[PDB]
Amino acid sequence: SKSKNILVRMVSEAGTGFCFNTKRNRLREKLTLLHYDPVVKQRVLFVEKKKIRSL
Amino acid sequence: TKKRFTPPIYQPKFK
Amino acid sequence: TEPKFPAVRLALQNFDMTYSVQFGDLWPSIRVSLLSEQKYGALVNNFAAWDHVSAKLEQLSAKDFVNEAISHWELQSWACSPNLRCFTFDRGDISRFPPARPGSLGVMEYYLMDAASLLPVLALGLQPGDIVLDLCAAPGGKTLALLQTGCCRNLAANDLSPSRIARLQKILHSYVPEEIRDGNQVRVTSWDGRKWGELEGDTYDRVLVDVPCTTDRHSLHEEENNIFKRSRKKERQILPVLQVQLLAAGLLATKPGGHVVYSTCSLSHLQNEYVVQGAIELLANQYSIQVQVEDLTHFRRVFMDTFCFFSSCQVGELVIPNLMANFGPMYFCKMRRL
Amino acid sequence: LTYFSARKGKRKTVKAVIDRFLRLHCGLWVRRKAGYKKKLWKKTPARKKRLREFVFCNKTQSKLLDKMTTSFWKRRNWYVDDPYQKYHDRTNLKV
Amino acid sequence: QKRREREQHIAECMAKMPQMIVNWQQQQRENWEKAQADKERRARLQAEAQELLG
Amino acid sequence: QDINDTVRLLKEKCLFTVQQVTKILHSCPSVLREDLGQLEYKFQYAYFRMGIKHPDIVKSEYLQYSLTKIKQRHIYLERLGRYQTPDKKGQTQIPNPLLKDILRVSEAEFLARTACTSVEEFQVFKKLLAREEEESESST
RNA sequence: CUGCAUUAAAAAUUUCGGUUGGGGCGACCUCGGAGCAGAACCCAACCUCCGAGCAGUACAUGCUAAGACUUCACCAGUCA
RNA sequence: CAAACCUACCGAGCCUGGUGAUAGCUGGUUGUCCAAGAUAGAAUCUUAGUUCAACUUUAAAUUUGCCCACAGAACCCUCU
Numbered sequence: 024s025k026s027k028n029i030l031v032r033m034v035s036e037a038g039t040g041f042c043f044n045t046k047r048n049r050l051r052e053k054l055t056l057l058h059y060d061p062v063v064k065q066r067v068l069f070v071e072k073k074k075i076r077s078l
Numbered sequence: 079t080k081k082r083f084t085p086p087i088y089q090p091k092f093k
Numbered sequence: 094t095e096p097k098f099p100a101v102r103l104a105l106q107n108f109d110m111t112y113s114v115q116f117g118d119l120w121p122s123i124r125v126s127l128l129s130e131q132k133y134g135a136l137v138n139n140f141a142a143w144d145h146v147s148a149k150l151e152q153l154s155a156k157d158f159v160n161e162a163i164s165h166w167e168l169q170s171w172a173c174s175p176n177l178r179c180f181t182f183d184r185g186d187i188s189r190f191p192p193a194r195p196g197s198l199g200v201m202e203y204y205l206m207d208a209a210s211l212l213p214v215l216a217l218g219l220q221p222g223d224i225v226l227d228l229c230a231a232p233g234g235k236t237l238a239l240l241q242t243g244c245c246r247n248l249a250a251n252d253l254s255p256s257r258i259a260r261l262q263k264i265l266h267s268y269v270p271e272e273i274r275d276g277n278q279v280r281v282t283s284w285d286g287r288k289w290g291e292l293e294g295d296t297y298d299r300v301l302v303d304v305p306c307t308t309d310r311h312s313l314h315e316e317e318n319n320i321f322k323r324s325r326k327k328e329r330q331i332l333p334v335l336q337v338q339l340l341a342a343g344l345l346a347t348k349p350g351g352h353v354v355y356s357t358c359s360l361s362h363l364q365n366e367y368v369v370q371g372a373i374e375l376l377a378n379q380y381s382i383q384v385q386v387e388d389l390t391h392f393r394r395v396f397m398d399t400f401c402f403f404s405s406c407q408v409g410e411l412v413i414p415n416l417m418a419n420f421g422p423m424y425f426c427k428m429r430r431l
Numbered sequence: 432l433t434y435f436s437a438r439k440g441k442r443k444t445v446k447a448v449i450d451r452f453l454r455l456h457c458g459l460w461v462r463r464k465a466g467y468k469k470k471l472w473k474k475t476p477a478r479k480k481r482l483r484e485f486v487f488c489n490k491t492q493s494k495l496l497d498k499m500t501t502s503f504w505k506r507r508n509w510y511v512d513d514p515y516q517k518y519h520d521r522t523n524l525k526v
Numbered sequence: 527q528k529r530r531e532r533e534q535h536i537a538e539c540m541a542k543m544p545q546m547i548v549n550w551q552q553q554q555r556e557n558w559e560k561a562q563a564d565k566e567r568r569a570r571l572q573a574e575a576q577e578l579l580g
Numbered sequence: 581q582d583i584n585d586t587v588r589l590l591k592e593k594c595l596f597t598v599q600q601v602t603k604i605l606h607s608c609p610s611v612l613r614e615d616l617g618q619l620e621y622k623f624q625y626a627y628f629r630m631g632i633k634h635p636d637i638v639k640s641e642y643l644q645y646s647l648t649k650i651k652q653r654h655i656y657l658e659r660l661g662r663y664q665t666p667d668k669k670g671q672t673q674i675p676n677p678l679l680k681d682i683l684r685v686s687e688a689e690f691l692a693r694t695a696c697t698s699v700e701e702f703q704v705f706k707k708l709l710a711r712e713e714e715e716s717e718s719s720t
Numbered sequence: 721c722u723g724c725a726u727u728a729a730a731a732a733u734u735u736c737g738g739u740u741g742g743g744g745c746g747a748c749c750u751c752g753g754a755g756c757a758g759a760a761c762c763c764a765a766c767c768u769c770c771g772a773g774c775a776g777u778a779c780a781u782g783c784u785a786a787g788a789c790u791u792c793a794c795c796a797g798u799c800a
Numbered sequence: 801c802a803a804a805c806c807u808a809c810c811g812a813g814c815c816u817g818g819u820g821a822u823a824g825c826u827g828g829u830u831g832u833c834c835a836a837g838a839u840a841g842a843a844u845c846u847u848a849g850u851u852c853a854a855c856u857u858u859a860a861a862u863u864u865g866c867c868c869a870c871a872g873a874a875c876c877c878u879c880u
């Protein structure tokens with residue numbers, strides 16, 4: 024039951040403070056995704072800040 | 079088979 | 094914990110009483126290595142940045158023994174499976190390879206496994222545009238090396254356990270690009286190996302048979318799913334009869350003139366040499382099939398630099414673990430169907 | 432449930448139901464969904480959507496909660512700007 | 527004060543938001559081309575490897 | 581005080597007799613400097629893993645030797661099969677080598693007589709053993 | 721002598737999950753697929769087994785909302 | 801050291817009190833007459849019990865309920 028993926032938090036770069044969680048591989052660089060931000064009603068970039076847990 | 083003993087009961091002598 | 098007589102100790106006790114006479118004075122030398130951490134080898138993924146990985150590994154003071162081996166192949170004088178790159182540390186070196194990291198191509202840079210596990214692949218003698226069959230493919234120690242060669246147009250991988258075959262798919266996805274596995278070039282199936290004698294008889298040119306066996310290195314360490322558990326005691330006794338059938342099934346499936354490699358991770362000749370003798374006797378009497386065992390002394394003479402070999406073998410080649418080189422234990426024999 | 436208290440001799444109230452359920456004056460009970468804050472990453476958006484509403488209880492549960500709650504919580508309240516004010520009475524209910 | 531400060535924080539971030547969006551997309555595309563170029567060399571290095579044999 | 585709890589450790593925790601403790605102090609004066617934790621671990625290592633009783637360890641001056649050196653020599657023999665830990669009954673299926681030739685003798689003759697192996701294999705094992713101990717200590 | 725800590729000593733309170741004739745030694749307890757259960761649904765063992773306790777690809781895998789289904793209750797789950 | 805003996809029942813004396821101890825266990829549960837009235841399951845340190853459900857009873861509101869003519873309910877697999 025080796026934990027190969029990790030749950031990480033994605034924080035918007037728009038400064039709205041909106042966050043959402045997604046799973047990622049341990050042996051990978053930090054993900055900079057493009058996700059919809061409900062605060063600004065448009066898609067903005069999200070960068071990874073902290074690791075939540077390992078699954 | 080523990081030793082089981084019931085001592086006799088004496089009725090009162092007034093009867 | 095366990096009540097009494099742990100399976101790890103039971104395996105060691107059986108090993109002691111069996112290998113004391115089998116190996117003589119060499120038993121204490123290999124006993125420590127079985128009880129000591131094994132030395133890992135780094136097979137370079139050709140689909141990844143092999144040149145950069147090789148350059149990176151060399152900076153960690155690692156040498157390509159396969160590339161060194163082919164250099165001495167002509168020096169000593171069917172060749173072997175080409176375009177294979179595996180890096181191992183020097184004799185007596187204790188450093189371990191760092192965990193593999195995916196490259197810019199999205200595939201894993203390299204794989205970590207026992208070095209002796211690569212020996213059956215080399216002795217198979219892969220040729221371009223060939224057909225490869227793999228009995229007991231999971232978890233994919235042999236299969237990944239076979240796909241690194243890239244000399245097989247179609248590959249058939251079979252293993253009984255769906256759980257282990259599941260992890261075989263994971264390593265194939267992480268290493269091999271999907272387009273190579275998209276077609277029927279790579280085929281993964283989960284049925285009994287004895288059925289290949291009737292499923293596709295005289296079909297495959299190259300077939301690799303790695304029968305299940307009492308893995309000496311794993312038994313002395315892992316405490317779960319142990320072959321020496323009293324519940325598996327019945328299964329352990331009937332291990333050779335399944336091994337001789339599995340070798341027979343592979344010998345039936347291969348085409349005449351094909352090459353067969355029988356490999357096992359053990360040191361007892363009961364599961365190494367007698368099984369090979371039993372299979373050739375069974376085919377001669379039952380199916381009237383003539384098979385010739387090739388001599389691999391020339392194969393052995395190139396590998397004493399990084400490997401330790403037992404020089405009292407009868408039919409195959411046995412690799413003994415040692416403190417200087419902990420690779421093994423691995424046995425492999427090459428035979429050709431006539 | 433304490434049917435007769437030792438200090439006043441009157442029925443008590445189970446505070447467990449007060450912290451978990453809301454009762455409307457019409458007799459309906461409003462509750463949340465179990466596990467609506469647990470393991471949100473492994474649940475589909477449709478499942479998560481239907482996990483975060485407020486749902487009513489059936490007849491047996493409503494009778495169960497009424498018996499465990501004294502008459503104080505069954506009174507009519509007139510809170511200012513109460514969000515659930517419109518739900519305290521039933522409209523167009525036949526039988 | 528905090529509502530104004532929060533709002534102007536979004537305005538400052540959203541003013542330059544398209545700038546790093548296209549920069550990130552450019553970086554995403556540029557490494558993909560580099561990987562393909564490396565594969566072309568890898569496919570090339572096989573060519574003389576076959577050529578050296580023959 | 582540091583002398584007080586040391587002999588209390590030996591007499592009570594290690595269960596040594598009064599005469600044995602005095603012999604330990606006289607034969608091995610170096611027991612006083614180091615802490616109690618590693619001495620108790622050294623003593624229990626011999627009592628359990630080596631299966632040697634009190635009169636043997638007070639006569640062979642086992643405590644005065646380094647904990648690292650005794651671990652390397654004992655584990656190597658146990659993995660070689662030359663040494664076997666006594667069972668619950670105290671019975672060993674093979675003759676246990678005497679404590680005298682394991683530790684009192686130099687490594688060159690110790691390898692030649694009991695271990696019967698080359699020097700470079702022992703050096704490789706020494707690095708291997710030191711690796712596991714620091715992983716075990718880090719884990720614990 | 722008092723208060724706060726650390727070691728021991730001597731003690732205090734409480735308990736012994738179920739299934740497999742019994743014991744020993746072991747096995748099982750949750751979820752899914754086919755057989756029984758032949759045609760709406762449902763249908764049991766000491767049942768015959770086979771597996772599962774993941775992964776992959778997205779990053780609108782966003783937000784609301786009619787109407788419905790259910791592992792024979794509830795909890796929960798499903799479609800839209 | 802016989803787990804002996806400590807006022808004719810000592811693996812922990814006797815009396816009183818807490819005490820109307822507790823007991824999913826056993827036993828018991830008092831006049832007359834009439835009517836309705838039986839065997840799907842789930843969970844459970846649970847199968848000697850309990851809760852939900854089903855069944856059953858009473859009162860009230862409403863209108864359809866049972867029976868059932870055609871038509872209709874899958875394929876790999878014809879115990880058609």
Ligand SMILES: C[S@@+](CC[C@H](N)C(=O)[O-])C[C@H]1O[C@@H](n2cnc3c(N)ncnc32)[C@H](O)[C@@H]1O
Nearest residue numbers: 229230231232234235252253254285286303305
């Ligand atoms: C000794 S392992 C070899 C692993 C792998 N081939 C390698 O070299 O690293 C053999 C595996 O084959 C599987 N196996 C056993 N019997 C089999 C059979 N009859 N048919 C197919 N696979 C079988 C077992 O699960 C066992 O783990």
Ligand SMILES: [Mg+2]
Nearest residue numbers: 820821822823
């Ligand atoms: Mg009572």
Ligand SMILES: [Mg+2]
Nearest residue numbers: 834835836837
């Ligand atoms: Mg009647």
